[PDB]
């Protein structure tokens, strides 16, 4: 190809500011939510877990990603590169599983009018790391000699030792998309639909459905970009570079408003519940 595989300057200018704003809003919102929770039932425990994992997700996602624009060289260590994606995937897993648990709890609150919540939260926090373990053993820095520079890409190595790791990397994008989008979205929607059917009031129904729609809309683009890179990338079309360039654009946008979904949970509590309204009020 021609080689215009690069990030636009206007893109950096917009994205640095946008990412900083969403990052700061998320940290203050989630810290305030956690403090209010600290100052007791199953919903409170699940919301606290969601907020804690949310804080972890933002602090592990935004800083390094926004560093990837100014420097795009990764001067860190091999172990940090091997570790960061594992923590990020674990945070995403606990976030989606906490959303699932919250939906189930809100269904059972109206359909069937803390130890069980603790044994369902430990299961979440261990299942997430169990399912994120394959990420921690795959990434590895390799210095490929580009025609003009000495790169330091921290990537998922195409050639690795373990055979199961190769088998997983074959369909990592598919598995990630499935487990982190389809299962939580479908389960949340089904449980909330049955919940609203049992109740029928309408305010709560529209609230939960708008929350589910916001989650899906704010989490779609990352999976869309990964799927497009997986299936629409070819080997013998000159347009490939442009597509890849466009992919980068879309990809970054995803991560930005991915964090937006992150910070949509505290705001949703401020806009609905009077108790939390008063809590955040002063």
């Amino acid at each position: 190809c021609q080689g215009p595989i690069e990030i636009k300057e206007t893109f950096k200018y917009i994205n640095t500011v946008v990412s900083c704003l969403v990052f700061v809003l998320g940290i203050i919102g989630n810290s305030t939510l956690l403090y209010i929770i600290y100052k007791r039932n199953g919903p409170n425990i699940l919301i606290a877990s969601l907020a804690l994992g949310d804080l972890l997700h933002i602090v592990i996602d935004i800083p390094i990603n926004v560093y990837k624009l100014l420097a795009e060289d990764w001067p860190f260590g091999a172990e940090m590169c091997k570790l960061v994606p594992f923590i990020q995937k674990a945070s995403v897993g606990i976030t989606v599983l906490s959303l699932c648990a919250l939906s189930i709890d809100r269904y059972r609150a109206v359909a069937s009018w803390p130890k069980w919540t603790a044994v369902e939260i430990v299961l979440i926090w261990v299942v997430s790391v169990v399912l994120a373990v394959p990420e921690a053993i795959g990434f590895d820095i390799i210095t490929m000699d580009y025609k003009g520079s000495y790169l330091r890409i921290c990537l998922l190595h195409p050639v690795q030792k373990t055979a199961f790791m190769q088998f997983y990397k074959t369909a990592k994008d598919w598995w990630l998309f499935s487990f982190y989008f389809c299962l939580p979205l479908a389960i949340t929607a089904f449980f909330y639909t049955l919940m609203t059917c049992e109740m029928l009031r309408r305010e709560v129904a529209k609230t939960v459905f708008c929350l589910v729609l916001v989650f899906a809309l704010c989490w779609l683009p990352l999976h869309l970009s990964r799927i497009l890179k997986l299936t629409l990338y070819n080997q013998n079309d000159p347009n490939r570079c442009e597509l890849l360039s466009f992919l980068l654009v879309l990809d970054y946008i995803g991560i930005n408003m991915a964090s937006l979904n992150s910070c949509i949970n505290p705001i949703a509590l401020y806009l609905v519940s009077k108790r939390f309204k008063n809590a955040f009020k002063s």
Partner: peptide, 21 residues
Amino acid sequence: CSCSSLMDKECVYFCHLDIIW
């Protein structure tokens, strides 16, 4: 990030410029 091979100078550059995910 996933590349078919480490010899094509396009996928590796793309993952150099991509996000960590």
